[model samples]
Target: DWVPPEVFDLVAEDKARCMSEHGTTQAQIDDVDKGNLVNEPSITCYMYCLLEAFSLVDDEANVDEDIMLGLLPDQLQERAQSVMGKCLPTSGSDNCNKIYNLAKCVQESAPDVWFVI
Candidate 1:
């Protein structure tokens, strides 16, 4: 496969961890999908947690372009950049806000590719 299977498995593991630790569920995630519900801290944390697990973002909640680009299949690199450009903040913010911004941008710009938690 173009994408490593382990990548998806790790994300799933992290998503489950987020659910147990943050009380975030797919139902809450669906709210995010509908928009105007990005303020939920748990849901935001869940998204952030998944990103960290995927190596798209770091422990400090900073985007790692190298890591992300290295992970994606060549065909998806452009789309990933578009997503990162729309989501990755230039300045720092709290974890919740960082994740909220990233998640919102991803869902808005690329619903088909957005990570579902």
Candidate 2:
């Protein structure tokens, strides 16, 4: 796995909570993680939930680039930063929408760098 194994365990409980809290199914998560996304709260808000749980994003959906980069595989960090640079000034009406925009930009810029917990 590109992710450090401990990273998954670290977010396991939070992933479950975010799923139910946002009415997101595991399949929906896989869909987006696999590069097929939908603009629904079931998926988008779940992203915000997970990012918040991981401290990857602030209340306004601004990304904590250092923290986020550290979580990625070492080689991916370079590509990941560029994605963050292009995506971090997140624009949206709500937190979920902010993450949605971030996700799409990441997807378009460097798809292989994205994954879900």
Candidate 3:
């Protein structure tokens, strides 16, 4: 598949991650990017979407890592790292941590949301 079965599966698995937290995930970044998901949602929401996208970018890179170990290259990894570096602040911030927590929660609740997912 164009997206690779695993990447596609990952997106499917995480779809609700964005939906359930759409309020926080999408709102802030949308406000920042003015409207556009960096790749999936918006490079920017309020501060929330930005955080989520940042986190997703990291996850994608990690998945790409496994994918690369088997097939692809470091391309996806570098891209995701680039985006995360650009978005994640050098200093600590609650936004990134907050998104991280929300993402963890969704991940834990997964397979069940597979219906609406």
Candidate 4:
């Protein structure tokens, strides 16, 4: 539960660490509330925290994008591509618009699935 000085760096610097720390929780429906995830850094932070707790890093560092990408299961990898393709700003921190667009992609890709899960 230490905040590294690097936290505010470009999303790429922290995204893998952030996403790794939170990946499991990101996949957990019960951990969060719907409709509140878009504007909330905590929502993302919570999931990233999970990643850190699990030590889900590659050989170099948790912040490495390639390591993060490599850790993804095939299904999530496909979903990530689909989500990113439908949204803009394919990299860096995804703004609310991108989040909404991603949600829409998820909706289109799967009828019963909901994010914040």
Candidate 5:
């Protein structure tokens, strides 16, 4: 994973804690990085949980695309914005599902922008 480090500010402990709380597996994280995703709560909720840790999303899983895009490297920011234009305003049965859908949409348009740290 040659992603820009700032793409994820999580430390080892932050990831460990989020994974423990959400029942996310190392394999699941690695799989999603490769753009392989299922609508499974373990990984879906894990994504929301991690994002919330940084207050990137609201209580209802509404992502602040401003800061979210800010985390990306400049080289990818323009493309990421194009992807997010279609992925924002999340909608699903739950927060986890909302994130799952957002990720799916983004992956479909720009898979390289996703980095499951």
Candidate 6:
């Protein structure tokens, strides 16, 4: 796997909690992978949950680009860099929505890695 073990572990735990506590599901993630659903509440919250798990966002809800890049594989980090500046939420909005936009942008920016089997 390109992802580090600890990062993978964090995602696993966060994914479970997103399903159990935040109503996110495998189906929703699959929909995102399929590009059929973007900005959906469950999907957005799932994104938020993962970012929170990775400590990629601050208490004030800013995305920490350095932290995020440090967690990714080199190739993915490059992919992320291509879109990072434009992905953040422009204003103070719902936390879930903000992360959704970020996640969607990243997914779209690197669909080959994010969505491919």
Candidate maximizing lDDT: 2
Instruction: Evaluate model 5: give its TM-score.
Output: 0.88
Least accurate 10 contiguous residues by lDDT in model 5: 1-10
lDDT per residue (tens digit) for residues 1-117 in model 6: 554556556467667887777787787777776766466677776666667766978665678889979866777776777777667642336887776656567667666776411
Kindly provide the TM-score of model 3 when superposed on the true structure, using C-alpha atoms.
0.29
Per-residue CA lDDT of model 2 for 55-105, tens digit only, reads 989999888888988877788888877776777789998999988888888
On lDDT, the stronger of 3 and 6 is: 6
Q: TM-score per candidate, in order?
A: 0.72, 0.92, 0.29, 0.32, 0.88, 0.75
In terms of lDDT, model 5 sits at 0.84
Where model 2 places Cα greater than 4 Å from the true spot, the runs are none
True-vs-predicted CA distance for residue 63, candidate 4, Å:
8.3
Candidate 5, residue 39: the lDDT equals 96
Local accuracy of candidate 3 as per-residue lDDT tens digits, 1-117? 124456546554344455455443435433423322232232212234422343532422222223323333344445434443443332223444443433333334332221111
lDDT of each: 0.72, 0.85, 0.35, 0.42, 0.84, 0.67
Every model: Cα RMSD to truth: 3.3, 1.2, 11.8, 11.1, 1.9, 3.0
lDDT of 4 at 69: 50
Scored by lDDT, model 6 comes in at 0.67
Task: Between candidates 3 and 4, name the one with more favorable lDDT.
Answer: 4
Candidates, ranked, lDDT:
2, 5, 1, 6, 4, 3
Best by TM-score: 2
Screening candidate 2 with a backbone cut-off below 3 angstroms (N, C-alpha, C), the clashing residue pairs are: none
Return the clash pairs for model 1, or none.
none
